[PDB]
Structures are given as structure tokens and as C-alpha cells.
């Protein structure tokens, strides 16, 4: 069995810069006969199936941007993107088909670096429809910020709340290369109504002070 080692595990690069990913096989992939290295590179974006970019180690498939170049022979291979763009955000895998079983590398995750951006924060009180069910969910969106690192903090009547909070983060946006996050604070209809001030505070390096969004039930 041929083991495929890919590095780095993940790479973050600015738009327009050159990117280099490497793949090494535990043994030669060169088919001395056909004199071709049976190594291919596949790109996989979130939720999609893999898609070939390079095969025979250095032959680019038609339709693949010429900024993608594969090189190498034997056991050492590299995939290079000459001028990375947001549409290149994905996970890349090399795969050998020299000797069965076919084996893939663990993949290299490619992400973009861009100018910092403060999150756009929106808070929403429970919907009348949900309350009419006996539940109260307060939602808060922290959209299109960068870097990916951010922290959210809720406050009911001025006091921190931590139980009942679920957070979710999107993959890097394929268009503006930013990140977004959703935070849902779920309480019982009774809990909710026994309070008036609901706040969502976002802490991001873009501001020394947190961005605060809130609403008063009495309003």
C-alpha cells in the first residue's frame, strides 16, 4: 500500500500570490513502461464532489485555469497556483493510481488572506410564531468579518448569559473571502418574558470596543 503525505495541512495566502502544495509517495509512482507518474490532483470545494485539476503529475485537464501547474516525478510532487484567487478556496488532494489500492493524501486546505473587516451585526427577537409555541429564540448574525477569529457574548438585562447558546460558522466566502457567524440564544417563553433587555456583543480585532446590538422587549 502506497502512503501519500501532503503538506502543509492548511495554507493561508493573499490574493494574487503564489501558492505551493506538496505531496510525497512512500514509493515511486513512475510507471517505467509508459514513463508516466500515476499521480493526480483534485480540488474539492464545500459541499461539492472532487474535481480533477492535474493528472500524470503534470498534465492539466482542459478548462482548468493555467495558473495551476503540477510538477514532480518518482515520490515528490507539487501543485502550484501562480496567482491565487477567491475561487481557489478549497481542499486539494493528490491521489496515486500506480498500485492498488488507490490512495489519497490527507489534503491541504487553501484559504485566502484579505484586509481586516468588522462584522455586520444584526439581532432579532423571537418570532411571534415561535412564542405562540412556548419557545423563545433570539438570533444574532455577525456577518462578513475578517480574520475568522471572533467572540460573541449575550446579556439579558445587563448580565452575561451562556447556557442555551448555539454558534455556527460558515466556510470562507467564495466572493469576498470573509467569514460569518450565527449565534442563537434559546430560552423558554417564560424566561424570555421575565426580562426586557437582550444584547448581542461581538468582539473582533477590528475594534477595541465590542460592537453591540440589542432590543428592549417593552419596545
Amino acid at each position: 500500500d502506497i502512503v501519500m503525505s501532503q503538506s502543509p495541512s492548511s495554507l493561508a495566502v493573499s490574493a494574487g500570490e503564489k501558492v505551493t502544495m506538496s505531496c510525497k509517495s512512500s514509493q515511486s509512482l513512475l510507471n517505467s513502461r509508459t514513463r508516466k507518474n500515476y499521480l493526480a490532483w483534485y480540488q474539492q470545494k464545500p459541499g461539492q464532489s472532487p474535481k480533477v485539476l492535474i493528472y500524470w503529475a503534470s498534465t492539466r485537464e482542459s478548462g482548468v485555469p493555467d495558473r495551476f501547474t503540477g510538477r514532480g516525478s518518482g515520490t515528490d510532487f507539487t501543485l502550484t497556483i501562480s496567482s491565487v484567487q477567491a475561487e481557489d478556496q478549497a481542499v486539494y488532494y493528490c491521489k496515486q493510481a500506480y498500485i492498488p489500492p488507490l490512495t489519497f493524501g490527507a489534503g491541504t486546505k487553501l484559504e485566502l488572506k484579505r484586509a481586516d473587516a468588522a462584522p455586520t451585526v444584526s439581532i432579532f427577537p423571537p418570532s411571534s410564531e415561535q412564542l405562540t409555541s412556548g419557545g423563545a429564540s433570539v438570533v444574532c448574525f455577525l456577518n462578513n468579518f475578517y480574520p475568522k477569529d471572533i467572540n460573541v457574548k449575550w446579556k439579558i438585562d445587563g448580565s452575561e448569559r451562556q447556557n442555551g447558546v448555539l454558534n455556527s460558522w460558515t466556510d470562507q466566502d467564495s466572493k469576498d473571502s470573509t467569514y460569518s457567524m450565527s449565534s442563537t440564544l434559546t430560552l423558554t417563553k417564560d424566561e424570555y418574558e421575565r426580562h426586557n433587555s437582550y444584547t448581542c456583543e461581538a468582539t473582533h480585532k477590528t475594534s477595541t470596543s465590542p460592537i453591540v446590538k440589542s432590543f428592549n422587549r417593552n419596545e
Binding site: 502543509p8 495541512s9 493561508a12 493573499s14 500570490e17 501558492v19 505551493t20 488572506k113
Partner: protein, 63 residues
């Protein structure tokens, strides 16, 4: 299984960041091999460890 976070600092000042996973030895080794790969175009390099060794800065001289 650890994760070595690396700062690839180029001559022009631009920066790319990478992560290598595995045993501290292999992950560190991978970082050094990756540096050699990038050296063929970015020049000679120096490496410095930090974060109990988990963080690393690799600076290329260029040329």
C-alpha cells in the same frame, strides 16, 4: 498529534501562514522540508521557534 503554526515571512515582507500536523518531530520536519521547497525561489532561510515550540517563524532572505 500536534499542530505547528508557521509564519512564512518573505523578503518583500509579505506573509503566508501554514499549519503542519502530526508528531512534534514530523510536523516540525515537514515545516523545514517545506521551507527548502520554497527556498529554491525565495532564498536562504532562518527559522525560530516559539509557543513552547508550537509556533514557528521562517524568514527568507530572497534573491
Amino acid at each position: 498529534e500536534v499542530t505547528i503554526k508557521v509564519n512564512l515571512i518573505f523578503a518583500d515582507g509579505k506573509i503566508q501562514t501554514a499549519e503542519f500536523k502530526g508528531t512534534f518531530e514530523e510536523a516540525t520536519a515537514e515545516a523545514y522540508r517545506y521551507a527548502a521547497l520554497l527556498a529554491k525561489v525565495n532564498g536562504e532561510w532562518t527559522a525560530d521557534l516559539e509557543d513552547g515550540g508550537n509556533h514557528m517563524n521562517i524568514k527568507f532572505a530572497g534573491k
